[PDB]
């Protein structure tokens, strides 16, 4: 019957640039009397709930809680939460199969038509399932010519450049290229370099 | 109590510190049990070590108030697989300091002295060590053909070492098909890294 707070310390953090629902509770006090402020972003109410949307990664967030029912102004403690960057995403190629279903290529073999129809590179948390949207700022494709030289080709933002497209078009079955130097941005406002993926032409 | 709602997650195979608190009750008066793995008191925290991935762990809490044990409401938590690690090459610089190569340029001597590949989370949290089960190195010949070479567990095979030894400055190779294992007992395939010989 009485409520104990069971909080894993690795999970008791706020993430910059996303919805952070927080259960702010005062024993024996109805939701309508509780009032809260934050020194990193916004703290708006969603009924019983509180949504923290902090902005500065690494800076600590101070949650001041006040209530009016007793004396004059009851001062609560005064809690501090760590504001972390979102996890770093992984690159993928979003393609449509022959039945028109959307799929995510995450390494291995992929048809030339599927690569070119995708038109570029994407980045997301693998988990996934929804949940946070990341953007590809830029990336390189590394090709290998007939002389065995590495040919790094710069992108057009998240899209393949015309030089990249020409290189992909002239690849034979079983030839390989690498998606490298992938720069991804998240709603936390953080830019990150993420790992490479190998693409084998089908 | 100011608690982020999405927090009923424990990771299998590692220590999960939990702040279990009852308002107005001293830590020593709080007792807790788990139905999945172990739950050990350590200072002001309880350390959960659950075992099966995809299962639920129920934490039962009691509080002592005078001569009476009060049963608190039970808490259900999801036991999850650990996050997937990223590959790196552990090398020693010219001053003998241990460094983690995570892509870019690396000297041939540093690659060979490392003797193999490692895998870890690219984050201060959690307290986790992963193991490289197997990997491939993909080299490119003068005809532009890819030469995939199989490892000796986490170590470079003799064929890999010979290929690395004959690489000139500016030549590239790829660490691919990296299979890693974690203390959650899960095997995962992780992304590639490009190595540019400096």
């Amino acid at each position, epitope marked *: 019957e009485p409520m104990a707070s069971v909080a894993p310390t690795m999970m008791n953090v706020l993430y910059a640039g996303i919805d952070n629902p927080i259960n702010i509770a005062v024993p024996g006090v109805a939701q309508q009397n509780v009032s809260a402020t934050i020194n990193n972003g916004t703290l708006t109410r969603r009924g019983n709930l509180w949504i923290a949307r902090p902005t500065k990664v690494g800076s600590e967030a101070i949650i001041s809680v006040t209530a009016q029912s007793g004396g004059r102004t009851i001062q609560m403690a005064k809690t501090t939460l760590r504001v972390r960057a979102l996890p770093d995403p992984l690159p993928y190629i979003e393609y449509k199969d022959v039945q028109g279903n959307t799929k995510r290529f995450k390494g291995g073999r992929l048809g030339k038509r599927e690569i070119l129809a995708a038109g570029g590179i994407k980045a997301a948390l693998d988990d996934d399932l929804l949940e946070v949207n990341y953007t590809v700022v830029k990336f390189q494709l590394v090709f290998y010519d007939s002389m065995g030289n590495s040919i790094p080709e710069v992108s057009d933002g998240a899209s393949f450049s015309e030089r990249q497209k020409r290189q992909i078009q002239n690849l034979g079955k079983g030839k390989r290229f690498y998606v490298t130097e992938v*720069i991804a941005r998240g709603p936390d406002g953080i830019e990150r370099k993420i790992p490479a993926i190998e693409v084998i032409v089908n | 109590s100011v608690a982020p709602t999405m927090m009923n997650v424990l990771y299998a195979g590692i220590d999960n510190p939990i702040n279990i608190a009852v308002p107005g009750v001293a830590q020593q008066n709080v007792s807790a049990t788990i139905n999945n793995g172990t739950l050990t008191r350590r200072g002001n925290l309880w350390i959960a070590r659950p075992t099966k991935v995809g299962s639920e762990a129920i934490i039962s809490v009691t509080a002592q108030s005078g001569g009476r044990t009060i049963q608190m409401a039970k808490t259900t938590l999801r036991v999850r697989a650990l996050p997937d690690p990223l590959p790196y090459i552990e090398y020693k610089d010219v001053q003998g300091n241990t460094k983690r190569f995570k892509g*870019g340029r690396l000297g041939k001597r540093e690659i060979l002295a490392a003797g193999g590949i490692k895998a870890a989370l690219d984050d201060d949290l959690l307290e986790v060590n992963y193991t490289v089960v197997k990997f491939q190195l993909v080299f490119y010949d003068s005809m532009g053909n890819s030469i995939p070479e199989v490892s000796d567990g986490a170590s470079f095979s003799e064929r890999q070492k010979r290929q690395i030894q004959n690489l000139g400055k500016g030549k590239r190779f790829y660490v691919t098909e990296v299979i890693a294992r974690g203390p959650d007992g899960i095997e995962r395939k992780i992304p590639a890294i490009e190595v540019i010989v400096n």
Partner: nanobody
Amino acid sequence: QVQLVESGGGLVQAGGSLRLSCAASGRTFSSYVMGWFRQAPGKEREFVTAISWSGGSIHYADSVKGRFTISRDNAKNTVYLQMNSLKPEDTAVYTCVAGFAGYGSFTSRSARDSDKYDYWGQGTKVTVSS
């Protein structure tokens, strides 16, 4: 390994402006986060500013925010530090840095961490007179 050479340092009057430049050797400039640290006499080394690989994200020390600007020109393998509204507290040896070649995020905390940069310049002296 990348070699960094700074230029543009010298004597400037308080309230004045000065642009520092840092030229990187090689053809890998675009793979690095570029930045500046400074060292004043009898003070701890201070992070000044850093710019991400794309130029889209920048971190500034609180003491220089709104006064100093960083920019990069990948075509010239050069990172610039535009100093404006210079104060005597800005007197220091300014060192250009390059790092973050591998995977990882560019946060305010990592930007400020001297261990995150493998390549350090020669340093350039900036003297701000009262």
